[PDB]
């Protein structure tokens, strides 16, 4: 939750077959926890050989397409699946379902490290995108060159550099590279605001956002409600459901050096915004913040409003 | 038919089912499992009552359907007609 000394625009990334499930109660764009884990993976595998510190991530999502279908008379939708290989006797496999989608996202990476003065900006940008072109972002492959990968160069920009006119000018020159984009932010305080509004009957927060991504048809003495924005339900972190265990206690863990607790994820709210409506760009970035003695592990955009 | 002797012992039932194909279960007002055996036998256990049944046997699958109750007619009808079909 440090303030960023720079911003890094991974400019245009086609994602091949990402995970469009995101939670047990959503299905659209993937969870922003995947983006936080991606930028932390870049912090691991190249972010220490350049003496930098990559924390924030700004989601943009230019173009979206999911592999769904509505089944011919039904009003809801289903997912398109894949054939898995056959069983041991070659009979058939038990089908689990996974939603798959195609993203075209752009990433804004906050940089904090002391190596911003030791290295030229283009070398930092080139090595970051050349590493990120061999990784994956929501369980989905990050696609190489296509018919129109002309904005291939990454760009780096220090937000502190220059005068106030210079900072805001270079900001609005960055926003010309987010052209059909729609940034995703967290709007937790609006969830508590509407809960304090309609908390006459039931102050359960599940009912609140379960009555916000909707059209609310009120009747004659029809006055359907007005949408304040593109409010959509998001998953917003994890809450524990078990006492934490030692690194050797839990059977079949991913390793034997980290403690494991069984958790439950923790639903939230946020809404998609154009990159003109935001004031600056340092307020737009996602950060992971955990309270480990309790079970509150979450991510948000701190210092947005 | 060794399993219908050792009735409540689900250790021997799970061994005699683990050599065979997997376990079916019924959720309705009552509660049933199914232990379908290799040689076209099944075994529904229900608490401390059961009914063994080997298929390719029409009277056994009709009284098997008679052994189940009426909210197991809401489910299970598309399967008690399926091995009625399979003969």
């Amino acid at each position: 939750v440090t303030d960023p000394e720079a911003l890094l625009l991974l400019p245009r990334l086609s994602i091949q077959n990402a995970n469009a499930i995101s939670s047990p109660l959503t299905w659209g764009f993937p969870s922003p926890g995947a983006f936080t884990g991606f930028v932390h993976a870049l912090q691991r595998r190249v972010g220490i050989s350049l003496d930098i510190e990559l924390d924030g991530v700004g989601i943009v999502c230019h173009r979206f397409e999911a592999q769904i279908s509505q089944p011919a008379g039904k009003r809801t939708k289903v997912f398109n699946l894949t054939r898995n290989p056959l069983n041991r006797d070659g009979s058939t496999a038990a089908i689990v379902e996974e939603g798959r989608a195609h993203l075209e996202v752009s990433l804004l990476l906050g940089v904090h490290g002391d190596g911003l003065d030791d290295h030229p900006a283009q070398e930092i940008a080139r090595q970051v995108q050349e590493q990120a072109g061999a990784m994956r972002l929501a369980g989905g492959s990050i696609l190489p060159w296509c018919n129109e990968r002309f904005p291939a160069p990454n760009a780096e920009l220090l937000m502190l550099g220059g005068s106030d006119e210079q900072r805001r000018k270079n900001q609005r020159r960055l926003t010309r590279r987010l052209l059909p984009g729609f940034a995703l932010v967290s709007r937790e305080a609006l969830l508590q605001q509407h809960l304090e509004t309609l908390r006459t009957t039931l102050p359960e927060a599940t009912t609140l956002d379960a009555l916000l991504d909707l059209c609310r048809i009120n009747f004659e003495p029809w006055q359907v409600r007005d949408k304040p924005g593109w409010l959509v339900p998001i998953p917003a972190g994890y809450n524990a459901l078990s006492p934490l265990y030692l690194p050797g206690e839990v059977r079949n863990a991913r390793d034997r050096e980290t403690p494991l607790r069984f958790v439950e994820n923790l639903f939230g709210l946020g809404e998609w915004l154009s990159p003109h409506r935001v004031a600056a760009l340092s307020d737009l970035l996602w950060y992971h913040h955990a309270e480990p003695d309790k079970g509150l592990y979450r991510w948000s955009t701190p210092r947005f409003v | 038919m060794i399993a219908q002797q050792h009735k409540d012992t689900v250790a021997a039932c799970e061994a005699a089912e683990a050599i065979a194909i997997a376990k079916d279960q019924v959720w309705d007002g009552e509660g049933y499992t199914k232990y379908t055996f290799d040689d076209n036998s099944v075994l529904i256990q229900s608490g401390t009552t059961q009914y063994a049944m080997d298929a390719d046997d029409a009277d056994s699958i009709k009284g098997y359907a008679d052994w189940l109750d009426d909210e197991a007619r809401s489910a299970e009808a598309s399967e008690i007609e399926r091995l009625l079909e399979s003969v």
Binding site: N239, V250, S274, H288 | Q25, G47, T48
Partner: protein, 424 residues
Amino acid sequence: QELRQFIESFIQERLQGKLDKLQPDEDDKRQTLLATHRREAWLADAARRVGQLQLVTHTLKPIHPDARGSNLHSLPQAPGQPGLAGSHELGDRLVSDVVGNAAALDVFKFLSLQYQGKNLLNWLTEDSAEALQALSDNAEQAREWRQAFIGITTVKGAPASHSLAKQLYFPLPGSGYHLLAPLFPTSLVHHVHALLREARFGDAAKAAREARSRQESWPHGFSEYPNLAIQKFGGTKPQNISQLNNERRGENWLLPSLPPNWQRQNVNAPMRHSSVFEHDFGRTPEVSRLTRTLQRFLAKTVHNNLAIRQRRAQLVAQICDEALQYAARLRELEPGWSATPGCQLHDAEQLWLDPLRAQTDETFLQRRLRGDWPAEVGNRFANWLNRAVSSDSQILGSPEAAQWSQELSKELTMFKEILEDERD
């Protein structure tokens, strides 16, 4: 021997259920073996097979169908921050769905009557008098039966996950990692399926929908759910995954969370007549939504200056934001934004639209749009914003119309300050 009348009634119903239509010999032996427990040892016949189920509050079989891990079933969590829904917000009246071998459902039915008129089975965490109110047997068998009855909402034997159970690393502030194994909230999703069937089906919401179709409905509020997805569990056998009932036949209902542009439109941006009657305005579904919101905001007043005074900043800023987004979305597909026959709003919109400084759009095009700025596109857009809503005695005979005029001047100045850095 205090208040075990429901226990005696359940023992009699268990003796008359299997013994309702029994045989002479096998029926008499089964009725005797049922009733001899049904006096007192019916808890013993239950606690023999008491470990074939589990009151799971967060199951793990829904993650991968062939995972064999731990079905941890504790209460959801402490709340923490303000806006976090979850299993904490249920509290009382939650559906603790039973998971296991589904042939011992009678044991869970017997243990599931201690809350419907009692304080020893639904409230068996205390009240030792409520525990001994119907036992009447020895203390060792009573203690073993109480342990078997308490072991129906507990662990499976060891804290165990699986290789197909969705484990993850979460990073700590400056330090290493906690490993996180999220589970499937069966209870919360059963609650939300009940709420969605209340909101989509039943009788009252359907009466409101056909009263909407009656065109003069009574005062009510009904829902409508577009863009739900369906996720199925188990495939063809959804009852091995437990208590998927007659509202969920493996039927997860997933709320939409899609991006703002999750239905793309192939932007055929011509200079034709269709790009002439909509070239200076840019008519579209979002443009029609903005025009309908402006026509609904035309009959507004000036007595709600904290809400309607705040609605116009988003309704006026959203128009310039959607116009700049439309210009960006059109300004990449066409390679050369040539002068099109019928570009009436493309007279100056031949540079207000996508100006390509290619070999086609040469230095004479790079100098016409270089020195000449898109102020006429900005002034034409400001005129179109003034003419989007109508003009009457409400736009000039009040301060709300003065607020609209000040917002129009501010939005035009903002769009002009944006467009000044476009060619510049």
